[PDB]
Amino acid sequence: AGSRLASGVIGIAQAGAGATKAVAVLKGDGPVQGIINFEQKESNGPVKVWGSIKGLTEGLHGFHVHGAGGDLGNVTADKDGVADVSIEDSVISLSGDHSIIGRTLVVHEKAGA
């Protein structure tokens, strides 16, 4: 039994004079679905990750971008199976050589734990 993932590619939403936005539509097995937004005002600036994921078993779930420097820790799903996400991370970026744009966001469907 290898780990089942819900995942989605991180796509560009907007550009500005430095400001970037991106979205990942997460899709997995059964009812697992979510939308995760990413925002950065300036290059090399902190990245605000926010959104929510539904259909997850209650508990912790591995949550990260597939690739180097892509660990965002875990998200916590409540008894409804809903995990609200709200992280600010300066490791990841939406520009440069390690831009998470075009890379795949994944969440472990197996709880924590």
Q: Which residues sit in the known binding site for Zn(2+)?
A: 71
β-sheet bridge partners, residue 48: 39, 88
Residues making up the binding site for Cu cation: 64, 66, 108
- What count of other Cβ atoms lies within 10 Å of the Cβ of residue 57? 14
Residues making up the binding site: 64, 66, 71, 108
β-sheet bridge partners, residue 99: 93
What value, to the nearest 5°, has the Cα angle with vertex 108 and ends 68 and 111?
135
What value, to the nearest 5°, has the Cα angle with vertex 79 and ends 76 and 83?
30
The number of residues making up the chain comes to 113
